[PDB]
Design an enzyme around this catalytic site. Structure first.
Site, PDB file in Angstrom:
ATOM      1  N   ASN A   1      30.565  10.330  34.932  1.00  0.00           N
ATOM      2  CA  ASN A   1      30.261  11.753  34.782  1.00  0.00           C
ATOM      3  C   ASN A   1      30.343  12.476  36.122  1.00  0.00           C
ATOM      4  OD1 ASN A   1      29.109  14.256  34.099  1.00  0.00           O
ATOM      5  ND2 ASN A   1      27.436  13.355  32.924  1.00  0.00           N
TER       6      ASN A   1
ATOM      7  N   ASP B   1      27.122  20.283  29.113  1.00  0.00           N
ATOM      8  CA  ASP B   1      26.706  21.018  30.304  1.00  0.00           C
ATOM      9  C   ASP B   1      27.871  21.526  31.153  1.00  0.00           C
ATOM     10  OD1 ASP B   1      27.541  18.771  31.737  1.00  0.00           O
ATOM     11  OD2 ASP B   1      25.557  18.183  32.403  1.00  0.00           O
TER      12      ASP B   1
ATOM     13  N   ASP C   1      33.395  13.496  31.818  1.00  0.00           N
ATOM     14  CA  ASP C   1      33.456  12.056  32.022  1.00  0.00           C
ATOM     15  C   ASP C   1      34.895  11.607  32.189  1.00  0.00           C
ATOM     16  OD1 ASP C   1      30.731  12.019  31.622  1.00  0.00           O
ATOM     17  OD2 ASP C   1      30.919  11.499  29.496  1.00  0.00           O
TER      18      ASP C   1
ATOM     19  N   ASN D   1      31.467  17.333  28.692  1.00  0.00           N
ATOM     20  CA  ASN D   1      30.076  17.311  28.258  1.00  0.00           C
ATOM     21  C   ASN D   1      29.569  18.719  27.958  1.00  0.00           C
ATOM     22  OD1 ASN D   1      29.812  14.444  28.674  1.00  0.00           O
ATOM     23  ND2 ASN D   1      29.760  14.876  30.863  1.00  0.00           N
TER      24      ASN D   1
ATOM     25  N   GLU E   1      33.578   3.561  25.386  1.00  0.00           N
ATOM     26  CA  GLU E   1      33.719   4.772  26.187  1.00  0.00           C
ATOM     27  C   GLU E   1      35.136   5.327  26.141  1.00  0.00           C
ATOM     28  OE1 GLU E   1      31.407   6.451  27.295  1.00  0.00           O
ATOM     29  OE2 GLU E   1      29.726   5.173  27.894  1.00  0.00           O
TER      30      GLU E   1
ATOM     31  N   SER F   1      30.057  19.432  32.718  1.00  0.00           N
ATOM     32  CA  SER F   1      30.594  18.286  33.423  1.00  0.00           C
ATOM     33  C   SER F   1      31.600  17.555  32.539  1.00  0.00           C
ATOM     34  CB  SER F   1      29.475  17.332  33.803  1.00  0.00           C
ATOM     35  OG  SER F   1      28.754  16.917  32.647  1.00  0.00           O
TER      36      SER F   1
END
Ligand SMILES: [Cl-]
Ligand SMILES: [Cl-]
Ligand SMILES: [Cl-]
Ligand SMILES: [Cl-]
Ligand SMILES: [Cl-]
Ligand code: NA
EC number: 3.2.1.17
Length: 129
Positions: free
Chosen positions: A59, A48, A52, A46, A35, A50
């Site tokens: 998220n 959309d 992380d 992301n 990650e 959002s």
């Protein structure tokens, strides 16, 4: 902060992640490697809108507030900026909620694709814990 492999394993163990919900310590180190490369300051946006955050790439769509993810939830009740600290406490406590949400560690796509079904104990091999 960029953790070493065994330094992170030790910190995760002290914060209660070893065998949390049945997931041995190597699972958590493995997911952190993929990650964030063990970097507490990692961020990634992301598709959309959002974002992380942190060593476990948690998220803002569900888990933290960053003020810029409309319609999102803040289920860990924390600012996303707290997931970037050199102290991993906030990330670990939120991860404990995520992993209990019904899907176990499948909540992290990267765990399913890169850790699940592999020899995760290798990630803690040699570490004095
Ligand atoms: Cl490593
Ligand atoms: Cl393990
Ligand atoms: Cl928001
Ligand atoms: Cl820490
Ligand atoms: Cl499970
Ligand atoms: Na949010």
């Amino acid at each position: 902060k960029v953790f070493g492999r065994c330094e992170l394993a030790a910190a995760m163990k002290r914060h209660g992640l070893d065998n949390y919900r049945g997931y041995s310590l190597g699972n958590w180190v493995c997911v952190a490697k993929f990650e964030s490369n063990f970097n507490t300051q990692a961020t990634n946006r992301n598709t959309d809108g959002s974002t992380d955050y942190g060593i476990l790439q948690i998220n803002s769509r569900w888990w933290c507030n960053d003020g810029r993810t409309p319609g999102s939830r803040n289920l860990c009740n924390i600012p996303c900026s707290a997931l970037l600290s050199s102290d991993i406490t906030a990330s670990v406590n939120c991860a404990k909620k995520i992993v209990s949400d019904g899907n176990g560690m499948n909540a992290w796509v990267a765990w399913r694709n890169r850790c699940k079904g592999t020899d995760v104990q290798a990630w803690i091999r040699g570490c004095r814990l």
